[PDB]
Amino acid sequence: MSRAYDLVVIGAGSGGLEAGWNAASLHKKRVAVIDLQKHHGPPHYAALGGTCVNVGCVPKKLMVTGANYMDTIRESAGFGWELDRESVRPNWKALIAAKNKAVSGINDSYEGMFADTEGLTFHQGFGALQDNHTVLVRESADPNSAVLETLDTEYILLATGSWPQHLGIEGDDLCITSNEAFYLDEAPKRALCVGGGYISIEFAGIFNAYKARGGQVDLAYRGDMILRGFDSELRKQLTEQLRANGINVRTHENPAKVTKNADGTRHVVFESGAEADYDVVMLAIGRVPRSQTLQLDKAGVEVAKNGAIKVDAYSKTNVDNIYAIGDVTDRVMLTPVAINEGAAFVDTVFANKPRATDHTKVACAVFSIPPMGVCGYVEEDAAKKYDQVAVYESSFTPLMHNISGSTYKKFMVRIVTNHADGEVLGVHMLGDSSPEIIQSVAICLKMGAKISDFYNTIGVHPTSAEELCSMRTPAYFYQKGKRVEKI
Amino acid sequence: SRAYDLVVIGAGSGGLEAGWNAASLHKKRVAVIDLQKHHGPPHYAALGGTCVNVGCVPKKLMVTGANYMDTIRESAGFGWELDRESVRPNWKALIAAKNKAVSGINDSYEGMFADTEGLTFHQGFGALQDNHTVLVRESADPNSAVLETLDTEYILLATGSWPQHLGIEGDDLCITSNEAFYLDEAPKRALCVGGGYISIEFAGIFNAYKARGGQVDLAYRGDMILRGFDSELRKQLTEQLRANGINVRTHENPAKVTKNADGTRHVVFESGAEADYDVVMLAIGRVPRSQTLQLDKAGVEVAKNGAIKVDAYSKTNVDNIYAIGDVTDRVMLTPVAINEGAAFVDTVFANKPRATDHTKVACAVFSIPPMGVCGYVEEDAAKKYDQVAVYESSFTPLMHNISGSTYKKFMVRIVTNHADGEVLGVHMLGDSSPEIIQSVAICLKMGAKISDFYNTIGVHPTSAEELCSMRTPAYFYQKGKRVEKI
Ligand SMILES: Cc1cc2nc3c(=O)[nH]c(=O)nc-3n(C[C@H](O)[C@H](O)[C@H](O)COP(=O)(O)OP(=O)(O)OC[C@H]3O[C@@H](n4cnc5c(N)ncnc54)[C@H](O)[C@H]3O)c2cc1C
Ligand SMILES: Cc1cc2nc3c(=O)[nH]c(=O)nc-3n(C[C@H](O)[C@H](O)[C@H](O)COP(=O)(O)OP(=O)(O)OC[C@H]3O[C@@H](n4cnc5c(N)ncnc54)[C@H](O)[C@H]3O)c2cc1C
């Protein structure tokens, strides 16, 4: 045309593909999506479908599902299931092969999508900017490589995601990150997860279920407690449940130096001086916005210090026809948020239905064993926003577990309210099914539920979630930031 | 004045709520009567009620156990190697573990009466001599020994319900869920008669614990199991029941049951079909247990079937006699019984009249896989509103590509009033739907409309996030008539 394409998307991931397909399918726009690869795995790891499909949500969940069988096969003994317990063994190679066929199945569906959505096209290569109206598809991330394509477009959407952060330390190249974790051929007998975030804890559980019999999994983390940013009672009890299933949680610990040993194992010396030896050292310390090879200065797009592309409520940049979504904008790095921003962008730009994504009261899960589901503010946050805050709590060991022998499995729910009017500002739980229970709780929190709304619903019995409906009396309060006990 | 403020007959889910709140909160003298102090034969229930003893608590423990059959099966896909021909379910170990759990709850209740001043337990069959005198006797027989007499200002009858029997010959050789909890061996061939949640729940428990060559038959008169639930989910669940090995026999009803020389029972079906089974469990319905209470000499009205007629506030036609829970036959679930017990104590001793909302009650079926349901079924909703829109999803979770249980479809169906978008009912089939529905009911009590579901951001990867993903109706009921175009 007077512009060959309507939109060029860089990144065929969660947001990118939502954006790309609705603009084409619903609005009949000519959309080009660029990505580095068509199927998961090395060298790029992510591919069509993004990080979540390929080296993220979907494979980690199957791998956590697989890991959960260590506890359910142990637990069947208390309900009468007799089996030769000595014969039980995990097979990591069997897991990675089924995960690999599941993930490649998805990859093949996306190809089909493009095949029958007129106006939608996959362009493979490294996307980079020439100016706000020309996108280059290059052979490599290097600015000097052969340009394969030069796409002239009206609108540019940048949806390139995140990448694993590294440690500055000597030996970093002898460490893997979650990307490689998915493709290991043998499960580590001893593994060090470093970081205290959800990817670290989730991977500590997987390695723990699949390790060989004298194995050990350590999780090292700089802070005082893992999962900073979560409810602190929940973070204390998940540390105890983790410990109870054998992960050695070593807080205030950080790698100093990693050295290759003769046999292959790595030798970590910790900043404390402490040193040990592991098959695998996996760094899960952070995820950084992946903006650096796009040549954003060619179009003049502004980025933050950490690389986040700065965007307004509507995801637009400081260049009027360039928008950005997902992890590269560094707001809430979760797939369903990337998708939502993906959809709000097409309503705004092509459907003149201007929406901004609401990044408040976004629920999320940690698929540790046992998992967590969390939504809204933590009481220390609430205590510096509200005047009168009430904290309701409840703790119990599912009766099941007095029969299965994992008596350490306390289900726990913490509700944080604004005590002036009873509106629920946060709901935090630890225990099985909590990922599933919290979905619909977020529906209540977006509606503006009060604690009355919760204790007046008749419970479904016998369930864990019926605790939600039984917390009538506050456990303690915060009169103006200070933990009070009567308000 | 009277010796007692309240005499509760039936120390179950409703009555223990009612007696402990009136004593502990209001400082009343409450006398609570039950037939025994510990679960088990001969009366099965005991202090704590049918749920604690021969109900929700044991059954859920037995379903959780039944479920390991599926998870040890399914673990192979994720790389767990096991000597799979060594796996044997042991019933006696299940029942024992169950019995140890229930007895400990029974002992909690010993403790509760020990420290609540004013609450006491009196053991025997309670029966009415007039509207201020309750008599505790040795047995249901009117001419049995009167162990003690209680003079009271109010009476609350919370006596529950009991298995419905089939009038056929051989009915004396069928068991019901009461005896199912106390069986010695797993039945290898079991017949579960009934299309309801108890029938389907026990068929799934027997299917997992039976001996290797066995079979569970689920027989029902109707056309499809689980009358009252969403039809599509009744349709889907039957397949998944069959896929795990249950011979589901619809349009079937025992006509006659006889004993065989080895004490297996022989059933002659109304179809002329014939079959032998170790156990024939009648789970055809629950009937209000009002018949031994001598309600007639206190002038109390019962319905045809035996429900004690009570108004919104659980008050009978006799001003100081109330009845709550199953015996009133409003919604026979435990949290409703409990709720009515607290409402009654507010109405009578706090004089804050409350009445129980029996309208948007969520309920779960702990079948394999389970169900979580709440609100209107589209057929009912379409009778009340003339623009209903039905939304629906089903997907097989990826886990189940890898586990091999590819028959396990998760399914959610939302029924709305299309005019305002108010959500009238949410119906789910699949694992965790009991848990997910609890919070869906909170939404539904607060008046959630469908845009509230889909404007929420999803928690990925979970089945629950499908709730937030339905923007388009599948069809509609225009003025009672189904239409897919309004
Ligand atoms: C181990 C792990 C676990 C996770 N678990 C969860 C979970 O359970 N739930 C959840 O919601 N979130 C989870 N996430 C995060 C989730 O993956 C992301 O929020 C989501 O994928 C971000 O969407 P996005 O659109 O920003 O980018 P992505 O899906 O990251 O899209 C990135 C895409 O851009 C491509 N790309 C990059 N540079 C270029 C270029 N120059 N040219 C062309 N293409 C390029 C990448 O190859 C490509 O796949 C997890 C992530 C990890 C790593
Ligand atoms: C097999 C089965 C499974 C169930 N599963 C569930 C479930 O998972 N969830 C759920 O919510 N509900 C379930 N229910 C139903 C639930 O058990 C009942 O709705 C509930 O317990 C009834 O409460 P109630 O207070 O009316 O009476 P109950 O709890 O039945 O209490 C009855 C009490 O009355 C006593 N009694 C009777 N007559 C007399 C008398 N003359 N004198 C003295 N004592 C007397 C009984 O012995 C006694 O325990 C289940 C029921 C059954 C049987």
Measure in Å the smallest separation between the Cα of B404 and chain A Cα atoms: 11
What does the block give as tokens for B27?
A: 């400082």
CA of B55 to the centre of ligand 2 (A): 7
Q: Which residues pair with A249 in a beta bridge?
A: A219
B10 touches ligand 2 (CB under 6 Å): yes
Mark A81-104 as b/e (b = at least 16 C-beta within 10 Å). bebeeeebebbbebbbebbbebbe
Atom 27 of ligand 1: nearest residue by CA position: A161
Q: Which helix (H) or strand (E) holds B215?
A: strand B215-219
Cα–Cα distance between A231 and B214 in angstroms, integer? 50
Nearest CA to ligand 2 atom 49: B49
Give the tokens for residue B71: 């998870």
Residue B459's domain comprises 360-486
10 Å Cβ neighbour count for A240?
11
Are residue A198 and residue A314 in the same domain, yes or no? Answer: no
**At B317, is the secondary structure helix, strand, or coil?**
coil
What's the CA gap between B413 and B393, in Å, rounded?
6
Select from A340, A453, A461 the Cβ nearest to the Cβ of B335. A461
B5 lines ligand 2 (CB under 6 A): no
Q: Is the Cβ–Cβ distance between B443 and A453 less than 8 Å? A: no
Residue among A83, A107, A457, A466 with most chain B CBs within 10 A, to mutate: A457
The count of domains in chain A is: 3
Q: What is the number of the ligand closest to the CA of A148?
A: 1
Strand order in the sheet with A280-283: A248-251, A216-221, A190-194, A280-283
Q: What CA–CA distances, in Å, run from A243 to A73, A155, A225, B240?
A: 19, 51, 13, 38
Q: Determine whether the interchain pair B81/A62 forms a contact, defined as Cβ–Cβ distance below 8 Å.
A: no
Cα–Cα distance for residue pair B277/B259, rounded to 1 Å? 10
What is the DSSP secondary-structure string of B92-125? HHHHHHHHHHHHHHHHHHHHHHHHSTTEEEEESE
Q: Which residues contact A198 (CB under 8 A, 6 or more apart)?
A: A227, A366, A367, A368
Residues of B in contact with A81 (CB under 8 A): 65, 68-69, 72, 87-90
The answer to whether the CB of B156 is under 6 A from ligand 2 is no
Q: Catalytic residues of B, which ones?
A: 460
Same-domain status, B393 and B463 = yes
Burial class (CB in 10 A: 0-12, 13-18, 19+), A323: buried
The one-letter code for the residue type at B47 is L
What letter would DSSP give residue B295? G
Q: A94 to chain B: which residues are within 8 Å by CB?
A: 78-79
Give which of B484, B476, B473 is closest to B385, Cα–Cα.
B476
Residue B375 to residue B442: CA distance in whole angstroms:
12
Residue of B nearest to A338 (CA): B457
Tell me the Ramachandran region of residue A64: left when phi exceeds 0, alpha when psi lies from -120 to 50, beta otherwise: alpha
Closest among B155, B113, B138, B104 to B36, alpha carbons compared: B138
Token duo for residue A336: 């369903």
Q: Is the beta carbon of B340 within 6 A of some atom in ligand 2?
A: no
End-to-end CA distance of chain B: 65
- The amino acid that residue A235 corresponds to is R
Give how far Cα B486 sits from Cα of A235, A455, B96, B382, Å. 51, 38, 58, 14
CATH of the domain at A458: 3.30.390.30
Structure tokens at B58: 């044991």
E strands along B260-311, which residues? 265-269, 274-277, 279-282, 286-288
- Whether residue B461 contacts residue B452, with contact meaning beta carbons closer than 8 Å, is answered with no
Handedness of CA A242, A243, A245, A246 (dihedral sign): positive
CA–CA separation, A186 vs A176, rounded Å? 14
Q: Which two tokens stand for residue A258?
A: 């990693």
Collect all residues of chain B within an 8 Å Cβ-Cβ radius of residue A457.
Answer: 362, 438, 441-442, 445
Question: Ligand 2 in contact with B61 (CB < 6 A)?
Answer: no
Residue nearest to atom 31 of ligand 1 (CA): A13
**Of B226, B260, B284, which marks where a domain is finished?**
B284
Same domain, A356 and A398: no
- Under a CB-based contact definition with an 8 Å cutoff, are residues A319 and A300 in contact? yes
Burial class of residue A352 (count of CB atoms within 10 Å of its CB; 0-12, 13-18, 19+): exposed
> What's the CA gap between A331 and A329, in Å, rounded?
6
Query: Which SS3 state, helix, strand or coil, does residue B89 take?
Result: strand
Token pair for B211: 């001996």
Q: Which uninterrupted H or E stretch holds B54?
A: helix B49-54
Question: B36 and B101 in one domain?
Answer: yes
Residue B383 tokens read as 């009778």
Residue listed under structure tokens 């410990």: A243
Which of B68, B436, B443 is opposite residue A447, by nearest beta carbon?
Answer: B443
Chains A, B: CB pairs < 8 Å: 255
Task: Tell me which chain A residues have a C-beta less than 8 angstroms from the C-beta of B51.
Answer: 461
List, chain by chain if needed, residues with CB within 6 Å of any ligand 1 atom. Answer: A 10-16, 34-36, 44, 46-47, 50-52, 55-57, 60, 126-127, 159-161, 178, 199, 290, 293-294, 326-328, 333-336, 338; B 460-461
Report the distance separating Cα B276 and Cα B64, nearest Å: 28
Nearest CA to B5 among B150, B157, B149? B150
Q: Is A439 on the interface with B (CB under 8 A)?
A: yes
Q: How far apart are CA A169 and CA A125, in angstroms?
A: 32
CATH number for position B335: 3.50.50.60
Judged by phi (left if over 0) then psi (alpha if -120 to 50, else beta), residue A394 lies in: beta
d(CA B208, CA B222): 25
| CB atoms near residue B265 (< 10 Å) | 21
- Confirm or reject contact between A470 and chain B (CB < 8 A): no
Q: Which residue is associated with the tokens 């409810």?
A: A231
Identity of residue A18: E
Query: Residue A294: which of A328, A266, A327 has the closest Cα?
Result: A328
CB A186 within 8 A of CB A207: no
Residue of B nearest to A459 (CA): B335
Strand bridging mode A31-35 / A120-124: parallel
Phi, psi torsion values for A301, nearest 5 degrees:
-70, 130
H helix or E strand, kind and range, residue B136 = strand B133-137
Partnered with residue B218 across adjacent β-strands are B192, B248
Structure tokens at B151: 């003079």
Contact assignment for A440 to B445 by CB distance below 8 Å: no
Which residues of A make up each annotated binding site for FAD?
35-51
Domain C-terminal end among A309, A327, A360: A360
Does residue A106 share a domain with residue A10? yes
In terms of Cα–Cα distance, which of B187, B189, B186, B193 is closest to B171? B193
> A268 and A175 in one domain?
yes
Q: What is the radius of gyration, based on Cα positions, of chain A?
A: 24
- Catalytic site residues of A? 461
Residue B422's SS3 state is strand
Which of the 8 DSSP states describes residue B81? E
**B171 CB-side CA count, 13 A:** 11
Question: Would you call B439 and A439 a contact, using CB atoms and an 8 Å cutoff?
Answer: yes
B371 SS3 class: strand
Please indicate, yes or no, whether residues A28 and A139 belong to a single structural domain of this protein: yes
Q: Which amino acid is at B197?
A: Y
Pair A394, A353 in one domain? no
Query: Which tokens go with A108?
Result: 């093949």
Compute CA distances B90 → A176, A416, B126, whole Å: 45, 44, 39
| Residue B91 CA to ligand 2 centre (angstroms) | 24
SS3 sequence of chain A = CCCCEEEEEECCCHHHHHHHHHHHHCCCCCEEEEECCCCCECCCECCCCHHHHHHCHHHHHHHHHHHHHHHHHHHHHHHCEECCHHHCEECHHHHHHHHHHHHHHHHHHHHHHHHCCCCEEEEECEEEEEECCEEEEECCCCCCCCEEEEEEEEEEEECCCEEECCCCCECHHHCECHHHHCCCCCCCCEEEEECCCHHHHHHHHHHHHHCCCCCEEEEEECCCCCCCCCCHHHHHHHHHHHHHCCCEEEECCCEEEEEECCCCCEEEEECCCCEEEECEEEECCCEEECCCCCCHHHHCCCECCCCCECCCCCCECCCCCEEECHHHHCCCCCHHHHHHHHHHHHHHHCCCCCCCCCCCCCCEEECCCCCEEEEECCHHHHCCCCCEEEEEEEEECCCHHHHHCCCCCCEEEEEEEECCCCEEEEEEEECCCHHHHHHHHHHHHHHCCEHHHHHCCCCCCCCCHHHHHHCCCCCEEEECCEEECCC
Burial B11-33 (b: 16+ CB within 10 A, else e): bbbbbbbbbbbbbbebebbbbbb
Tell me which chain A residue has its CA closest to the CA of residue B80: A90
- CA A451 vs CA A427, B74, B339: distances in Å: 10, 40, 17
DSSP run (H or E) holding B469:
none
The structure tokens 């029938």 sit at B199
Cis peptide before A43 (omega within 30 of 0): yes
Asked if A440 has any chain B CB less than 8 Å from its own CB, the reply is yes
Quick one: CA torsion of A40, A41, A47, A50, rounded to 10 degrees?
Answer: 80
Chain A residues in contact with B208 by the CB 8 A cut-off are: none
Mutate to test the interface with A, among B460, B467, B468 (most CBs of A within 10 A): B460
Number of H helices, E strands in chain B: 14, 25
Please identify among residues 398-417 of chain B the ones whose CB lies closer than 8 Å to any CB of chain A: 398-399, 401-402
State how beta strands A275-278 and A266-270 pair. antiparallel
Q: Which of residues 196-235 of A touch B (CB under 8 A)?
A: 210
My answer on whether A274 and A308 are in the same domain is no
CA of B46 to the centre of ligand 2 (A): 9
Ligand 2 closest atom vs CA B51: 17
Task: Identify whether residues B19 and B151 lie together within a single domain.
Answer: yes
Contact between B390 and B429 under an 8 Å Cβ cutoff? The reply is: no
Whether omega for the bond prior to residue B42 falls within 30 degrees of 0, making it cis, is yes
The verdict on B407 and B315 lying in the same domain is no
Write down which residue in A360, A376, A391 finishes a domain.
A360
Task: Give the CB-side neighbour count of residue B111, counting CA atoms within 13 A.
Answer: 6
Distance, in Å, from the CA atom of A356 to the CA atom of A361, rounded to the nearest integer, reads 15
Of A382, A375, A384, A391, nearest in space to A336 by CA: A375
Q: What is the DSSP letter of B445?
A: H
Fill in the DSSP letter of residue B68: H
CB contact at 8 A, A6 and A15: no
Q: Is the dihedral of CA A378, A380, A384, A388 positive or negative?
A: positive
Resolution in A: 2.6
Of the bound ligands, which one is closest to the alpha carbon of residue B39?
2
Query: Which pairing describes strands A476-479 and A388-396: parallel, antiparallel, or unpaired?
Result: antiparallel
Q: How far is CA A474 from CA A458, B155, B376, in A?
A: 20, 34, 34
Angle between the N-to-C axes of helices A57-75 and A198-210, in degrees from 0 to 180, rounded to the nearest 10: 50
List all residues of chain A from 305 to 364 with a beta carbon under 8 Å from chain B. Answer: 334-337, 339-340, 358, 362-364
Does residue B150's CB lie within 6 angstroms of at least one atom of ligand 2? Answer: no
Write down the residue that tokens 């959407």 correspond to: A157
My answer on whether B214 and B318 are in the same domain is no
Task: Spell out which residues of chain B touch residue A441, defining contact as CB-CB under 8 Å.
Answer: 439, 442
Sign of the CA dihedral A399, A404, A410, A412?
negative
Q: Which helix (H) or strand (E) holds B255?
A: strand B254-259
List, as one string, the DSSP characters of B137-162: ESSSSTTS-EEEEEEEEEEEE---EE
Q: Which atom of ligand 1 is nearest to the CA of A287?
A: 53
Question: Residue A217 is encoded by which pair of tokens?
Answer: 């999994």
User: For residues A374 and A231, is the Cβ–Cβ distance under 8 A?
Assistant: yes
